[PDB]
Amino acid sequence: VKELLEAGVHFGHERKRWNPKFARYIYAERNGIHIIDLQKTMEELERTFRFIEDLAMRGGTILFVGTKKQAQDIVRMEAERAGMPYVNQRWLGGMLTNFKTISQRVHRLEELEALFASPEIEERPKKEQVRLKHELERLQKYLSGFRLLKRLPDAIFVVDPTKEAIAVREARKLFIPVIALADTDSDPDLVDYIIPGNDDAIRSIQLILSRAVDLIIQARGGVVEPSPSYALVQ
Amino acid sequence: MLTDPIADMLTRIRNATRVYKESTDVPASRFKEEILRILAREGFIKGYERVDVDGKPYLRVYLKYGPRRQGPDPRPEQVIHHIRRISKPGRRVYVGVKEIPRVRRGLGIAILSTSKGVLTDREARKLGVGGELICEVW
RNA sequence: GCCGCGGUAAUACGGAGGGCGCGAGCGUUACCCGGAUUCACUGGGCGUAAAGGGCGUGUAGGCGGCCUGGGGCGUCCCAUGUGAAAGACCACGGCUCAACCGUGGGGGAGCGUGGGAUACGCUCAGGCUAGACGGUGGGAGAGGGUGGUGGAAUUCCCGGAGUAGCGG
RNA sequence: GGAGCAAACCGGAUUAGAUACCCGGGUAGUCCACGCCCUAAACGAUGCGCGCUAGGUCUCUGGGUCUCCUGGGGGCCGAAGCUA
Ligand SMILES: NC[C@@H]1O[C@H](O[C@H]2[C@@H](O)[C@H](O[C@@H]3[C@@H](O)[C@H](N)C[C@H](N)[C@H]3O[C@H]3O[C@H](CO)[C@@H](O)[C@H](O)[C@H]3N)O[C@@H]2CO)[C@H](N)[C@@H](O)[C@@H]1O
Ligand SMILES: NC[C@@H]1O[C@H](O[C@H]2[C@@H](O)[C@H](O[C@@H]3[C@@H](O)[C@H](N)C[C@H](N)[C@H]3O[C@H]3O[C@H](CO)[C@@H](O)[C@H](O)[C@H]3N)O[C@@H]2CO)[C@H](N)[C@@H](O)[C@@H]1O
Ligand SMILES: [Mg+2]
Ligand SMILES: [Mg+2]
Ligand SMILES: [Mg+2]
Ligand SMILES: [Mg+2]
Ligand SMILES: [Mg+2]
Ligand SMILES: [Mg+2]
Ligand SMILES: [Mg+2]
Ligand SMILES: [Mg+2]
Ligand SMILES: [Mg+2]
Ligand SMILES: [Mg+2]
Ligand SMILES: [Mg+2]
Ligand SMILES: [Mg+2]
Ligand SMILES: [Mg+2]
Ligand SMILES: [Mg+2]
Ligand SMILES: [Mg+2]
Ligand SMILES: [Mg+2]
Ligand SMILES: [Mg+2]
Ligand SMILES: [Mg+2]
Ligand SMILES: [Mg+2]
Ligand SMILES: [Mg+2]
Ligand SMILES: [Mg+2]
Ligand SMILES: [Mg+2]
Ligand SMILES: [Mg+2]
Ligand SMILES: [Mg+2]
Incomplete structure (x- = not known):
């Protein structure tokens, strides 16, 4: 049950600060903000998760990268709650x-x-x-x-690929695929597996980052709770 | 005033493709349509169609690319790598059938206007004719 | 030849040994094309390297949107005449070979005549409104010309007050 | 026509010298009319016209259903691309 839990508080993001290559994933500019297409996120979600599912069960590795401050911590929760590597402070x-x-x-x-x-x-x-x-x-x-990782990873999960551009660069340079939660900020074309969302909201980063780490353990059996992932959430 | 509509058309294509546009409109002409037909048949474009833009005849033209690519710069390979007028208002170029050129050892076309209609090099060579050498596409 | 060698350790000068290249020749000078996409048709350039005319108006010229029809000048096609010999290309032959040469074949731009095609270019006739121009209404502007007019300042002239310097 | 400024020129400084830079004078000229001259770092050092190819931001000037949209003009950053 993803679906309307996305509308939860996790749809739309920034405004007139956009990359126009992100135009396909946009539903409208209601109220001078770019509201990102809810449902296209879902179409991108399955395709992405499916790549993670496959990557997970093959025993491969994701590298989680969130250095922007709202993600700093909710990244190191879910990554540890997945036995995966993460980069947190500085790329x-x-x-x-x-x-x-x-x-x-x-x-x-x-x-x-x-x-x-x-x-x-x-x-x-x-x-x-x-x-x-x-x-x-x-x-x-x-x-x-x-x-943790002592050979290059098999993929990287990036929170804001514009914020985290030096990282994406290197991935692509090395042909490591790039999963990312991205928004109107960013150039989609150089994200392989994109999750059109909201790089800012601690809600959005959370909803997605966690459920993706469900799949990661759930491709290995024996899922846990919806996680310690609520800082002093508010 | 627009001196060469064919060069225009070609260039609209050249330009739209370089930014991976899904389509371009180009003001409609029967002659233009005939060149597109070839273009479509030979698998350079997806296809084309008549439309009205501000109630005036265009030809929307569906472009077509490779797949996504690997490393840095995953922009698709292009199907129309090259497209280029030959005969032009400033200087018409006409050929007999014996001097129709082989474009990129045949991995490329040359569109070509003849008294048996617009044709590719191969069509026209087998049909044994020449005429105005419109453009070469690879 | 160009870059440049020679001022006490010169593979650059002169000689030696050795080596390289061609060989009844090998070098030199001179001249043509090449490389030189360095006059660029193929095939170049002009913001700062050489190179955008100081700017306009506009003649000749060059170039010319969309639809239909006629002509067939360009253009394309077929057939035919012509393109001598030599030379050039390929066979097969003659001098022992080759050079040289005989025979036969094959090309060959260009131009003439007859036939055909009509997409594009031209042309003639017809149509359209996307270019262009015009009409109505509304605008901003140290665009230009003529006449008038305003205040501040500098100089000079006259008057007052004032006195030993001012200016630089 | 001529207030002010000021090539030349007449003086004062400075300097080794000073045909200059600084100071004091000062004619042409700078001003007006008419007629010439026709040059320039006459510069965006970028010929004119037309179509096509992301955006963002500031500004001048029109129109709209005036949050925003849509013309014309002047700047800045920048897609694709171009460039030694
Ligand atoms: N040199 C710059 C400018 O060229 C201008 O005109 C030229 C340019 O607008 C344009 O030239 C383009 C050039 O823009 C662009 N950099 C790409 C292209 N290679 C050039 O094109 C030119 O050269 C190529 C061969 O290189 C030719 O095959 C082509 O037909 C020719 N148009 O087309 C004109 C052809 O010379 C103006 N003359 C003037 O502004 C200035 O000279
Ligand atoms: N026409 C019959 C004979 O044809 C000959 O014409 C032929 C020969 O001269 C010559 O042919 C021979 C070739 O067949 C044979 N297989 C090899 C030989 N190298 C060629 O010879 C030629 O070429 C070389 C270099 O180009 C030169 O010695 C010289 O140009 C000429 N001898 O080229 C022509 C075709 O082979 C003579 N030129 C002519 O005097 C004689 O009549
Ligand atoms: Mg660091
Ligand atoms: Mg286009
Ligand atoms: Mg012939
Ligand atoms: Mg010695
Ligand atoms: Mg020597
Ligand atoms: Mg010697
Ligand atoms: Mg040459
Ligand atoms: Mg050229
Ligand atoms: Mg050059
Ligand atoms: Mg210059
Ligand atoms: Mg100019
Ligand atoms: Mg003109
Ligand atoms: Mg004219
Ligand atoms: Mg025409
Ligand atoms: Mg004819
Ligand atoms: Mg002969
Ligand atoms: Mg013999
Ligand atoms: Mg003939
Ligand atoms: Mg007409
Ligand atoms: Mg003096
Ligand atoms: Mg003076
Ligand atoms: Mg004075
Ligand atoms: Mg400019
Ligand atoms: Mg503008």
């Missing part, structure tokens, strides 16, 4: 395109993971229980969810 240049190298930083993280619970939580020169331990802070900050 770094070449997480994908220069993966090998950015990986070496994961490699470094767990050398320092290995010195907190260690005999050297007592020793190390004075100016190194900040020098080393502050290095682990940043590595913790950016490479929280990215620490």
Whole structure:
């Protein structure tokens, strides 16, 4: 039962800030806002989910990327609630395109993971229980969810592909398909599997991000609750 | 005033296709229609049809592309890679049948107006005629 | 030849050894075409590289929207005359080969005559209204010409007051 | 015709010199009419006309059912594309 749960508070988005290549997915400009076509979202939904279903059961990987602030957290919920990687704070240049190298930083993280619970939580020169331990802070900050995948993913799920354009670029460059929740903001043509929605509303990001992680576990059996996905929602 | 309606038509097509338009209208002419027929038969366009735009005769023209493509820039391959007038008001070009050219070793057409009607190179060569060399499409 | 070598370690000068290339020849100079899509038909350019005329008006010229009919000048087709020989292309032959040559075949732009086609171009006649022009009503404007007129300022002249400098 | 400005020119400075830059004078000229001249970084350094190809934003000027839509003109950012 998706359907009218979309009208729920999740249809339409921005206004006169549009990309005109997103014109097909628009129903009208009621009240000076671009109300995005409800039902075309559904036609795009199944096709997308179907690709995820297939990708999920094949034991592949999605990379979740939401760095815009309203998504920051609801992304790291659903990604963890799917055992998938996520990128949350900053998309770094070449997480994908220069993966090998950015990986070496994961490699470094767990050398320092290995010195907190260690005999050297007592020793190390004075100016190194900040020098080393502050290095682990940043590595913790950016490479929280990215620490998981250790070969390129098989797809990426992007929240705002215009906000997250550097990421999409790299995907396509590498022929990694691009799933995205996108809206009037964005150029659809370079999203492979698009979910015409609303990159802003915590409702919309939530409704979609979660139900997609249903399918992900549900292609593996044994679904859980509609998730810890309500920050202090309001 | 529009000096060459055929060049116009061709160019409307060239232009609409370069931004993956679904269709273009082009002011209607019988001659224009005959060129489209060929164009359609040879699978460059989907097809075409008469219409009125502000109650005046056009020819809507349904364009046609490849599939979506892979990496960066997934814009479709084009069916009309090339389309180009030859004979023009400034300089008409006429050929005998022995000097009708082979367009891109035949992977391409040349439309061609003859006294046995508008024809492609092959149609006209087998029909043993020449005439005004209108345009080449690949 | 062009780029450039030579000022004490010159594969660039001169000689040696060695090597490369052609060979009864090999180099030089001169001249033509090439490369040179560097006069661009095929096949180029002009915002800053060379290159948009200072701007208009408009002659000759070039180019010309949509529909129907007539003519068939361009255009296309068929047939035919002509395109000598040599040379050029291909066979087969003659000098031992070849060069040279004999025979036969095949092309060949262009032009003449007769027949045909009528899509596009031209032409003649007819139609249309999408170009163009016009009519009605409404507008903004340091567009232009003539006459008039206003205030501020500078200079000069006259008057008052004022005195030792001003100006730069 | 001539107020002011001002090539030339007459002076004062500055300078090694100063045929200049600075200061003080100053004629043509700058002004008007008529007649010539016909040039320019006469520049958008971009010939004219026509059709076609995303948008966004600011501005001048018309019309509409005046939130918004639709002409004409002047700018800015920019699709496709073009460009050394
Ligand atoms: N050079 C720029 C301008 O060219 C203008 O006119 C020219 C341009 O408008 C246009 O030329 C186009 C050019 O715009 C565009 N960059 C693409 C095209 N290659 C050119 O085209 C030209 O050259 C090609 C060969 O290259 C020819 O095959 C073609 O027939 C010819 N029109 O068509 C005209 C042909 O020369 C004006 N003369 C003037 O504004 C200025 O000279
Ligand atoms: N017509 C009969 C004979 O034909 C000959 O014409 C022929 C020959 O001269 C020549 O033919 C021969 C060719 O058949 C044979 N298989 C090879 C030989 N290379 C050619 O020879 C020619 O070409 C080369 C280089 O082009 C030159 O030596 C020279 O041009 C000529 N000898 O080209 C023509 C066709 O083969 C003579 N030119 C002519 O004097 C003689 O009558
Ligand atoms: Mg960063
Ligand atoms: Mg078009
Ligand atoms: Mg003939
Ligand atoms: Mg020596
Ligand atoms: Mg030498
Ligand atoms: Mg030597
Ligand atoms: Mg040449
Ligand atoms: Mg040319
Ligand atoms: Mg050139
Ligand atoms: Mg120049
Ligand atoms: Mg000009
Ligand atoms: Mg004119
Ligand atoms: Mg004329
Ligand atoms: Mg005509
Ligand atoms: Mg004739
Ligand atoms: Mg002969
Ligand atoms: Mg023999
Ligand atoms: Mg003949
Ligand atoms: Mg008429
Ligand atoms: Mg002086
Ligand atoms: Mg002076
Ligand atoms: Mg003075
Ligand atoms: Mg401009
Ligand atoms: Mg405008």
